[PDB]
């Protein structure tokens, strides 16, 4: 979380790195993106573990 | 990380 925001009302989450990474990777996956992709692979590792 | 807190001759061709 490179936190440089102004307000947290705009964001509907708790700023956990887990949730942040989760919202990230889901925003990625809504793009048609292969699950074998590196970044998503790492993200999935995080998701599994978390 | 930065501060989080904020507000005889015949010529041939020559050349």
CB of A40 closer than 8 Å to CB of A33:
yes
Helix (H) or strand (E) holding A1: none
CB of A21 closer than 8 Å to CB of A44:
no
Spell A7-45 as b/e; 16+ CB within 10 A means b: eeeeeeeeeeeeeebbeebeeeeeeeeeeeeeebeebee
User: Distance between CA atoms of A31 and A26, rounded to whole angstroms?
Assistant: 9
* Residue B15 DSSP class: -
Task: Indicate which technique resolved this structure.
Answer: cryo-EM
User: Distance between CA atoms of A18 and A46, rounded to whole angstroms?
Assistant: 8
B14 Cβ neighbours under 8 A, 6+ residues apart:
none
Count how many Cα atoms sit within 13 Å of the Cα of residue A35 in the half-sphere of its side chain.
Answer: 3
Resolution limit, Å: 4.6
């Amino acid at each position: 979380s490179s936190g440089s925001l102004l307000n947290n009302a705009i964001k509907g989450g708790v700023e956990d790195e887990v949730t942040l990474s989760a919202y990230i990777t889901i925003a990625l996956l809504e793009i048609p993106l292969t699950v074998t992709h590196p970044v998503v692979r790492n993200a999935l590792f995080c998701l599994e573990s978390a | 990380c930065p501060q989080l807190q904020q507000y005889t001759v015949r010529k041939y061709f020559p050349e």
